[PDB]
Amino acid sequence: DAEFRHDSGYEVHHQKLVFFAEDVGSNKGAIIGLMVGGVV
Amino acid sequence: DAEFRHDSGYEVHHQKLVFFAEDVGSNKGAIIGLMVGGVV
Amino acid sequence: DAEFRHDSGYEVHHQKLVFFAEDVGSNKGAIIGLMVGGVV
Amino acid sequence: DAEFRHDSGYEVHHQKLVFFAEDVGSNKGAIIGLMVGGVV
Amino acid sequence: DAEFRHDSGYEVHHQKLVFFAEDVGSNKGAIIGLMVGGVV
Amino acid sequence: DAEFRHDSGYEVHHQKLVFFAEDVGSNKGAIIGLMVGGVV
Amino acid sequence: DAEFRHDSGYEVHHQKLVFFAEDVGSNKGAIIGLMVGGVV
Amino acid sequence: DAEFRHDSGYEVHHQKLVFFAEDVGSNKGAIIGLMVGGVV
Amino acid sequence: DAEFRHDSGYEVHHQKLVFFAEDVGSNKGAIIGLMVGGVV
Amino acid sequence: DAEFRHDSGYEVHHQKLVFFAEDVGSNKGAIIGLMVGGVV
């Protein structure tokens, strides 16, 4: 007469989570404040 | 007469989550504040 | 006379979620504040 | 005389969700504040 | 005399949801504030 | 018998030019790619 | 018999130019790629 | 009989140029790639 | 009979140029790649 | 009969140039790659 209970508040089996973040907030391109040329 | 209960508030089986973020807030292109040329 | 109960408030089986975000808020193209040329 | 109950408030089987966001709020094209040329 | 009950408030089987957003709020084309040329 | 010539190809006297660009291509308001809620 | 010539190809006197660019290509407001909530 | 010539190809007198660029390409507001909450 | 010539290819007198660039390409606001919370 | 010539290819008198760049490419605000919380 075994109860054979399984009682888990959270059960996770076989779960894969991948989180990928690439290039958040990054300057691969040039940023120039000012360019001044040829000023007389 | 086994009860054979399974009682889990959350059960997850075989779940894959992929979160990908690419290039959030990023400057691959050029940003220029000002360009001034040829000023006499 | 086994009860054979399954009692899970949330059951998930075989669920795949993919979230992809690409290029949120990103400057691949050029942004220029001002361009001034040829001013006499 | 088994009850054989299945009692899950939410049951999900075999669900795939894909969320894709591309180019939200992004400047692939040029933005120029002003261009002034040839001013005498 | 098994009851054989299935009692799930929400049951989902085999559901695929795809949400795609492309180019929300994005400037692939040029935006220019002003262009002034040839002013004497 | 002074000639008293003034010969200037371009003459500018007392000229003020103001160019103002405000908020070109800018997101003061929120942009959201997708909002998904309450999905079972 | 003085010639008293003035001969300048470009003459500028008293010229003020102000160029102002504000908030070109800028995110003061929030941009969100996706928001997902409450997904079972 | 003095010639008294003035011969300058470009003459500039009393010229003030102000160029101001503010907040080009800048994120004062929040940018989020994805927000996921409450996923079971 | 003095010639009294002035012959300067470029003459500049009394010229003030101010170039100001503020906050080009800058993140005063938060940028987050992903936020995931409450995932079971 | 003095010639009294002044012959300067570029003449600059009394010129002040101020160039100011502030906060080009700078993170005063927080940037986070990912935040994950509460994952079971």
TrEMBL record, chains A, B, C, D, E, F, G, H, I, J:
Location of this chain's protein in the cell: Cell membrane; Cell projection, Growth cone; Cell surface; Cytoplasmic vesicle
Source species, domain of life: Eukaryota
Family, as annotated: Belongs to the APP family.
Described function: Functions as a cell surface receptor and performs physiological functions on the surface of neurons relevant to neurite growth, neuronal adhesion and axonogenesis.
Name of the protein in its database record: Amyloid-beta A4 protein
